[PDB]
Amino acid sequence: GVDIRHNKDRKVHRKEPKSQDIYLRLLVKLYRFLSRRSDAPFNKVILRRLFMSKTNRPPLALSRLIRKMKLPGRENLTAVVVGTITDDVRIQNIPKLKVCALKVTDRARSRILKAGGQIMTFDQLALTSPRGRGTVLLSGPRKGRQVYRHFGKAPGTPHSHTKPYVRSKGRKFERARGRR
């Protein structure tokens, strides 16, 4: 026999979108052809995110997309995001965005188009930019869910700052012995 541990032979990486969506699996059939033959590091990152789940594809608000486009060097590039571009109602101006995403909400689609912008899809992106040139791949706040506020050391340890699971946030709910 051979002295080797088979504990971590399997690499747990999603190699196929767990969704049975038809249009999403067609984009996978498109970017798998580019991840093999285009020889561009952009298509290899879009292919991963087409597999990822909804929690690994968080929304991207307009304000969080506008600020990343106003950085120096993003003059006439595209804002690629594998997910939904939600609207940020507490922002006012839209500076002529050129985005490309799977879904765009009805208000975000209106504010981008009314400002003269352009909204694309991942099939049009692979048509005009097969190498992925002139793109700015963005993402949303993956650690922005309420679920991550409960993850930590423990609610009852020093320097925890972890949100405990309670039925209702009140006075008689876990504030007596250990919180003072």
């Binding site: 026999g1 051979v2 002295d3 080797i4």
Partner: protein, 61 residues
Amino acid sequence: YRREIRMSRMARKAGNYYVPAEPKLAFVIRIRGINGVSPKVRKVLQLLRLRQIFNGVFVKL
């Protein structure tokens, strides 16, 4: 091969000795099995890339 013979002959000619240079290459062969190995010895056999019985590697000395 002929140089080490030359150095050994000129040392015996004068009654002296010529100690050859210690070897710089070694061929290690694992002979024992893989069950019942000490953790300090098992770690070395993994660094020598000798994980199964009857396999050989070259080791710089």
